[PDB]
Copies of this chain bind each other. A is one copy, B any other.
Amino acid sequence: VAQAQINI
């Protein structure tokens, strides 16, 4: 399981 979170 791979999760990516980008806040911008």
Contact = CB atoms under 8 A, between A and B. Distances in A.
Q: How many copies does the complex hold?
A: 10
A interface, over-half SS? strand
A6 B8 CA distance: 8
A2 to B, nearest CB: 4
Interface string A1-8: 11111111
Contacts of A4: 3-8
B2 A2 contact: yes
A7 to B, nearest CB: 5
Contacts of A8: 2-4, 6-8
A8 B2 CA distance: 5
Interface of A: 1-8
